[PDB]
UniProtKB/Swiss-Prot annotation, chain A:
Gene field: D
Organismal lineage: Viruses, Duplodnaviria, Heunggongvirae, Uroviricota, Caudoviricetes
Region described as Disordered: 1-27
Gene source species: Escherichia phage lambda
InterPro entries: Head_decoration_D, Head_decoration_D_sf
Compositionally skewed regions (Polar residues) per UniProt: 1-17
Name of the protein in its database record: Capsid decoration protein
Curated annotation (Swiss-Prot), chains B, M:
Keywords: Host cytoplasm, Late protein, Viral capsid assembly, Viral release from host cell, Virion
Record's subunit section: May bind head-to-tail joining protein W and protein U.
Protein name: Head-tail connector protein FII
Job of this protein: Plays a role in virion assembly by joining the head and the tail at the last step of morphogenesis. Six FII proteins probably bind protein W that closes the DNA-filled capsid, as well as the U tail terminator protein of the pre-assembled tail.
Chain coiled-coil ranges: none
Presence of keyword RNA-binding: no
Location within or outside the cell: Virion; Host cytoplasm
Gene Ontology biological process: virion assembly
GO cellular component: host cell cytoplasm; virion component
Gene field: FII
InterPro entries assigned: Phage_Head-Tail_Connect_sf, Phage_tail_attach_FII
UniProtKB/Swiss-Prot annotation, chains D, E, F, G, H, J, L, N:
Record keyword Protein biosynthesis present: no
Organism: Escherichia phage lambda (Bacteriophage lambda)
Subunit structure comment from the entry: Monomer in solution, assembles into hexamers on the prohead. May bind FII and portal protein (Potential).
Name of the gene: W
Main location: virion
Function: Plays a role in morphogenesis of the virion head after genome packaging. Presumably interacts with the portal vertex to stabilize the packaged DNA within the head after packaging. Probably binds to the head-tail connector protein FII.
Compartments it resides in: Virion
Keywords per UniProt: Late protein, Viral capsid assembly, Viral release from host cell, Virion
Gene Ontology biological process terms from the UniProt entry: viral life cycle
InterPro entries: GpW, GpW_sf
One of the Pfam families matching this protein, by short name: gpW
Record lineage: Viruses, Duplodnaviria, Heunggongvirae, Uroviricota, Caudoviricetes
Taxonomic superkingdom: Viruses
Record-given protein name: Head completion protein
UniProtKB/Swiss-Prot annotation, chain K:
Organism: Escherichia phage lambda (Bacteriophage lambda)
Subcellular location: Virion
Gene: B
Disulfide bonds: none
Interval of the full protein contained in this chain: 268 to 374 of 533
Protein name: Portal protein B
Subunit description: Homododecamer. Interacts with the terminase complex composed of two small and one large terminase subunits.
Reported function: Forms the portal vertex of the capsid. This portal plays critical roles in head assembly, genome packaging, neck/tail attachment, and genome ejection. The portal protein multimerizes as a single ring-shaped homododecamer arranged around a central channel. Binds to the terminase subunits to form the packaging machine.
Posttranslational mods: Proteolytically cleaved by the viral protease during capsid maturation.
Protein family membership: Belongs to the siphoviridae portal protein family.
Taxonomic classification: Viruses, Duplodnaviria, Heunggongvirae, Uroviricota, Caudoviricetes
């Protein structure tokens, strides 16, 4: 009658340790957890990544926050699956999304 | 595209047969000018007897290409198949996915329009 | 005979599938999730039952008895060897 | 080309099941036919090409038991 | 499109069962035929389609016993 | 649609049983045929459809034994 | 209305078994074929329809034993 | 009317298995063929029809033994 | 031989169905899909 | 010169599965029939050719066991 | 009889495949391809291979190595003992 | 002359496997046809002719065991 | 060799039917001069009545030879069917792999062209 | 007259294997055809003729054994 599906939650697809860091942010929209972020061009406050600033990705969110959050926590290292992480709708290229965090300790499997 | 469920199949059949048994034809002159198509050339033979007797020997070559590319060809233009050069005299009406092309030989005889 | 028993016991079962070998191993036997050729080792957990689709099969070879007359045959040969050596069969064998 | 190959194959499978696996096409003077395939082999080919393709989850690993 | 595919499968099965799948048509110069699928295969296909789609419950699990 | 569909299926079964399942029909130039099903499959389809529809049952519990 | 169908079915049984079921009729340019059922399934249909209709008794309950 | 059809059937059996079961009849543009049947089925049909109709004794209750 | 006996015993039954694995195991083996690890 | 053979064989298998392996071709006097192959041998040929050619890793051997 | 038993026991399994023998043995019997020597294989834990249709690995049931040969030896030895004049138990 | 017919047979096998082994060809009363073979016999013929000719090693001699 | 996929089979069939059917005819005179070819010879019977009774019952020999071996055969030259001798009266156009040689008996009648 | 027999039979074997065992020939009123043998019996016939004729040895005697 009423049956659902329960799926195990694992942010990591590999034995690569993941590590977190805190930094001031300039978020303007309610950001759910584990959202990509970049720095502002002018004040380099942290802000959710838009998808068109190619190569600007710096980290992935740790805990949900909003505009009121003066500082935010994010992941600097670790391997993450392609689907468990949400993306801004502007980045419509699968290859771009996969290669967004190339050149840092954040990797996409 | 085709409201028949049969036109697509017959077009597929015509394309397959032209691929597996046809030959390249190089259209010359006309609006298409130099272009390449694929057609199933044949040269049936016919004989006429003029007067008490005249054995004028000839043939009635045909191509049977698909209509889509054969559009806007008219009659004045000519055709070259491999090393042989012909000229369209008549285009049969579309059967649904193709039509026969009747060819003369050499140069079309004048125009004699007006 | 020892090597024959070894090999007969070595290959317990076989699997038939059309997929990738790694995928077949994962979806008929399990394991995978390796840390980082050698195919893939499999944990020996509790009893498990796999899933199959047409063209996928699991066949467990029954092998054969490991002592099909070998014991009595070597018993007779030991009788002969004891007779040759001059010692009693029980003492020799 | 995996995605469109899969889509075309699945659509052909559905058409064969329903009404339109055309065996032969005949217009007066021109008759051709395509070979006829089984259904189970087509289904397993579909399944294996799917699992080869990077599509979503379709299979699971055996089954667990616990009292 | 799963729901309309299921509807098409249902209608095709009904036609097959009663009288209404055409093996070939001929118009004295044009004729075309279609391969005939097995009724069991059609039933299996439609059943798996019903299960996979967002249709409601059709089959429950194994039945336990109680004294 | 279930009730009239079942009635039509029963009528078709009766027609096939007696004489009326038209295998093929041809007029001058035009010829078609309808793929013919067996009898057991048709009758089990009838039975399952009559069961699944809401009219009166024909199936009961297994049995009961008393001395 | 089971009685008329039963009469039709038994008449079909009779004529088919003797000589008078035409498998197909071919008038010049006007031809039709009818699917030919067997006698086994035909008498099965006869039995099931005659027992489901409220006609006379045909079969009874097992058989006793006594010394 | 069991007797009439039984006599017709038995005469038909005799004629057919001797030489004269017209399978098909042809005119210029007229083709008519009837379905064919085995012999065992019509034989057992004749037996059952005769026994069910009030004819003379033809079968006897088993067979006993005595010293 | 010990390992061979272990592996032979550890499989017991086997299911087969063109249906999806999760739904097939729910409908046949019961399972607990209402509550990876399969 | 094996990779192009692999590509051709894969394309042939795909079209044969879907709709497009032509058996006969007829043009009002000229007809060509091609021998009909099966699916099992075709995929066996695909597998043998792909394993012999410079195709990458696709197959692995036995299995390990541990507690 | 001893030689025949040697042969029958020494042949235990058969593998057949359409592709190359070296690759087939690598992918079925494990083998040590990373290193006619053929391909000797290690003897580790119990292993199960995967095979596509066309290939097949079947073990041989062999045959009982002493199907009455012991009784035949018994009769022959008793005959030899009778010929020699020594008792069967002493001789055998 | 070994490698020439080796290559010829290999090409014929590739053709038959793919799509265009000409079973028969006809054109206006000029009809011929060629006998067909089986893929199994063709492959084993390929293998045996390869062994007979001086092609490199493909099969080896059993495989010993060692702990 | 040729962009047909079908004319190759046609040529193979033609070679096979030449091998299994027909005889070896050798040519005399002409640019080919002496040459030996394989062809299937047939001789249907034809009769004309002309006036009251002028039955001139004769034969119409045909050979059906491949065009490749009979290129520029002309018409004036003669042909020999083993012990028997003929002369080519006409040549059909090729149907794709060969044509038909239609023969007359005796010696060709003059030239009569200038 | 065994060497040319062997050559002809082997050539026939090879062409049948590849593509060139013609069965029927037709000349619009002048047509014939030949019966076809089997690959296995043709091969064993080849083997028998070569072993009976004076060509080189092709098979040895059993197989020795030693520790």
């Amino acid at each position: 009658t009423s049956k659902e599906t329960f799926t195990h939650y694992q942010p990591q697809g590999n034995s690569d340790p993941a590590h977190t860091a805190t930094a001031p942010g300039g978020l303007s929209a309610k950001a759910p957890a584990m959202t990509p972020l970049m720095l502002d061009t002018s004040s380099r406050k942290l802000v959710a990544w838009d998808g068109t600033t190619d190569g600007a990705a710096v980290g992935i969110l740790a805990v949900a926050a909003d505009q009121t959050s003066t500082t935010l926590t994010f992941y600097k290292s670790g391997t993450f699956r392609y689907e468990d992480v949400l993306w801004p709708e502007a980045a419509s290229d699968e290859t771009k999304k996969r290669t967004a965090f190339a050149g840092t300790a954040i990797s996409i499997v | 595209d085709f409201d028949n469920l049969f036109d697509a199949a017959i077009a597929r059949a015509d394309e397959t047969i032209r691929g597996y048994m046809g030959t390249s034809a190089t259209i010359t002159s006309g609006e298409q000018s130099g272009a390449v198509i694929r057609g199933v050339f044949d040269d049936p033979e016919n004989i006429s007897y003029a007067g008490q007797g005249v054995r004028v020997e000839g043939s009635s070559p045909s191509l049977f290409v698909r209509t889509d590319e054969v559009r806007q060809l008219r009659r004045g233009d000519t055709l070259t198949i491999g090393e042989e050069n012909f000229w369209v005299d008549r285009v049969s009406p579309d059967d649904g996915g193709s039509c026969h092309l009747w060819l003369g030989r050499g140069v079309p005889p004048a125009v004699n329009r007006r | 005979q020892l090597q024959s028993a070894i090999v007969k016991a070595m290959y317990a079962a076989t699997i038939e599938s059309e997929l990738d070998t790694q995928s077949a191993m994962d979806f008929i036997l399990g394991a995978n999730s390796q840390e980082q050729y050698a195919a893939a080792p499999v944990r020996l957990g509790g009893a498990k039952v796999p899933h199959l689709m047409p063209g996928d099969s699991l066949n467990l070879q029954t092998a054969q008895d490991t002592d099909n007359g070998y014991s009595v045959f070597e018993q007779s040969l030991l009788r002969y060897i004891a007779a040759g050596l001059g010692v009693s069969y029980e003492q020799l064998s | 080309t995996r995605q469109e190959e899969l889509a075309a194959a699945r659509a052909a499978l559905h058409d064969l099941m329903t009404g339109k696996r055309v065996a032969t096409v005949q217009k007066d003077g021109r008759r051709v036919e395509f070979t006829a395939t089984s259904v189970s082999d087509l289904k397993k080919y579909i399944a294996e090409l799917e699992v080869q393709t990077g599509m979503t989850q379709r299979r699971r690993g055996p089954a667990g038991f616990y009292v």
